[PDB]
């Protein structure tokens, strides 16, 4: 659970996934966490979210995973173990955020996307979250979708 134990490589393509081994590495500083899902007019994805987050002084799930020396299984909608691993990592990341949260959300989302079905409900249940603002991945339009 220690955020400073963040240097030794944890490679989940070579070991069994257990989210409790990375709970500390998934911690974030307040008012920095980003989420993302979907595309607008084809524009979006994990890399657009990473660029937007880093330009605004924040982090994403994937940037946190990379920066803390974790390798996740390749996500594939038809490989159950990788679906479960990403769902659990997303849930623990979301459990631990605080303050003002941002999300790069496209107008077209995949069925079963983790944002609508896992992460956003977790954030609404998180008393430490004070605001959720979406950012369109193509246009940059921002909307406050939740403010407690
Ligand atoms: Cl994903
Ligand atoms: Cl859905
Ligand atoms: Cl997803």
Author numbering: 252 to 399
Question: What does the literature reporting this entry say, word for word?
Answer:
We discover an ADP-ribosyl cyclase/cADPr hydrolase (ARC) encoded within a bacterial type VII secretion system in Streptococcus parasanguinis, which we term Tac1, and demonstrate that this enzyme rapidly hydrolyzes NAD+ and NADP+ into ADP-ribose and ADP-ribose 2′-phosphate, respectively. Indeed, a single molecule of Tac1 is capable of hydrolyzing approximately 12,000 NAD(P)+ molecules per minute. This rapid consumption of NAD(P)+ and the release of linear ADP-ribose and ADP-ribose phosphate species suggests that, like toxins belonging to the NAD(P)+ glycohydrolase family, Tac1 inhibits bacterial growth by depleting available NAD+ and NADP+.
